[PDB]
Symmetry: C2
Subunit: 317 residues, 2 copies
Amino acid sequence: LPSGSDPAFSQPKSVLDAGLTCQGASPSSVSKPILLVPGTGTTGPQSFDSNWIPLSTQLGYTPCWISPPPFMLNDTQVNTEYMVNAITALYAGSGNNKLPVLTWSQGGLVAQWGLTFFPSIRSKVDRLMAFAPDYKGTVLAGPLDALAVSAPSVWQQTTGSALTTALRNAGGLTQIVPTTNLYSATDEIVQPQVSNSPLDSSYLFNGKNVQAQAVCGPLFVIDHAGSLTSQFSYVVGRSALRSTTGQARSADYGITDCNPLPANDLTPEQKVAAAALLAPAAAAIVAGPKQNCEPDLMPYARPFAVGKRTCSGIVTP
Amino acid sequence: LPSGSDPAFSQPKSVLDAGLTCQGASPSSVSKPILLVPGTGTTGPQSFDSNWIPLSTQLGYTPCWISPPPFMLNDTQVNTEYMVNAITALYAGSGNNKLPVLTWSQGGLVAQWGLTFFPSIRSKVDRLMAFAPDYKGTVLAGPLDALAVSAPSVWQQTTGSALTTALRNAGGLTQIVPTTNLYSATDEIVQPQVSNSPLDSSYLFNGKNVQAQAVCGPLFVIDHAGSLTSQFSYVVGRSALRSTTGQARSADYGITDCNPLPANDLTPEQKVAAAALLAPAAAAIVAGPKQNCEPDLMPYARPFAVGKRTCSGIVTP
C-alpha cells in the first residue's frame, strides 16, 4: 500500500463538509458515530434510510452518511474525498475515536480507495463492513459503456477500468482495516461474484468473505439490493460492527439467519422501501450525467494504470 | 370486449414485416411455430436466445419473435401492431393454423392489448404463456416518470396510465384465449405482484395464474428476469405449451421444481447469459428515448380511458 502525506482534495473542505450529515448530532460534535457510504445512483438517505440508518441506532450508533453529488455518479475519486473528509471530521468530532464504516455497492470501492491512497485515515477507521462491494468492478457495465451513456463512476466500476486497475496494482485488493464482505452469486449488478474465491469482485485478501450461497447453499437467491438490506445481511452486519476483532464471525450467523427478504426489525413500510431500493437508483442513472470515456485518474493514482484509456487518452507515466 | 373491424395500422404493412423473424424458417413457410414477444428495452434475441429460443427448439417448436424499434421503448400500441401483423403471418404461413405465444414483461401486456383491440387475431392465437406480465403496469416506473426521463412505453407501463386504464375498461383483464401467467412477488420491476390474487398486475380472469411463492413458499426469490429464465419457469412454460386445456396445472410442477437458477437444460454459457438478461435492457433504457408525458391513445382505445392525461391533454368524448 502507498504512503507519505495525504494527496490534496480537489474539492474545498466546506464542499466536502456539506456532503456529511449525522442523525441526531453535528458531525464534529458526536459520539458513537457510524459512517454510511451509499451506492451508485443514491444519496446517503436514499440508500440507507430504509435499512441501516434505523438499524445502526438499534445498536447504539449515531448514524452518519455522505451524499457525494450527483447521486454517486461523479468521479469515484471525488466520491472518496467525501469519505476521507468525513472520517477526518468524525474522528475529532467524536473525541479522536476510531469509527466503523458501513457501505453498499460503490461505497465499498470508495472505502478501499480512500484506505489505499489516503494513509492518514487508516489509523482512524475502526473497521469496514461492505455489502456487495465491487472492488474489481463489474462486467455488467459493458453494454452501458458500449452505448457511451455511462456516468463517470459507472465507467470506473467496469471490470478492467483504469480505476479498478489502479486499485489492484496499488495493493488495494488486500484489506487494510478489518473488513467484512457480504455478497452474492446471484447479484444482477456486480459480476463475477460466483466462484466464492479471490476471483470474486467483492473478495479482499485477509478479510471476512461471505458469499451468501456458501452459508445458505446453491439455491439461495439475493440480488444486489437484498445484499445490503435482507435479514441475513443484518445478522452479518450486527456481528461485524460489535466484534472484538473488527470482522464478522461465523459464530453469529448460519441457515437460521439466512433470510432473503428485508430485515425483521424494519417497519412494514421500511420493508417495502428496501424491497424497492434499486428503483430510485435506476431513475437517477437514466437522468444523471453520461459520457463516452472513463474519467482521468488523479496524479496520486495515475501511475498505477499506465496503458489504460481515459478521457484524455492512454494513461502514461 | 370490443369487436367489428380491426383498427387501421399506423405502421406500414412492410415496416411491420421487418420486425418478424424465425429460427430456420421463412415467415410464410414456418412449421410448429411459437411467437416470442420480448421485454422492455430488448429485442427478441436479447430477451430469449439465452432461454426460450433454445428451450422451444428442444420442445419441438420453431422459435419466432418480433423486435419492434427501438428496443420496445416506442408506443405499446405500435409495439402491438408488430404482433398483430406477426400473428397474421405465422397463421397464414403455417397453413391457416393457430399458434402459441410466449412473452416476457411488456410482451404480455402487448399480447393482451392486441387480443383486446384486434378482433381478427383472436381467431388465430392458440394460447398465451406470459412471464412476469404487467397488465396493470407497475408503480416502480414512478421515479423515472417524475424525472421526465421515461420512454413512451415506460409511461404506458406505469400504474394508472391511460393505456393500462383503457385495457381494464375494454375487458382486457380477462383472458381472451387460454392463458397462463407465471410471476414472482419479489419482482423488482413490476409491482404489485404480492397478494396472489386479482390485484396482481399479472392476473387475468379465467387464466391460469401461477405466483412462484404460492408453491415455493414466502422465501423463494426470483426477480423479473428469473420469472422468465428459471428452471421452475421452464416446467410451467412447458406444461402450458403441452396442455390440451390450453394452460398449465399443478400436476406438472411441485416443490421439487423450486429451482430459481436458470433452466438446467441450458448450456453453461446460456445459463450465464440468462442470469444477466437485465443488463442490456437497462442500458437500452438509459440510452433510449425520453419524454415528459404518456403517448396519446389511438382513437380505437382512447374512449376507454376518459379522464386520463396524455401528451395532447385530458381525454373526453
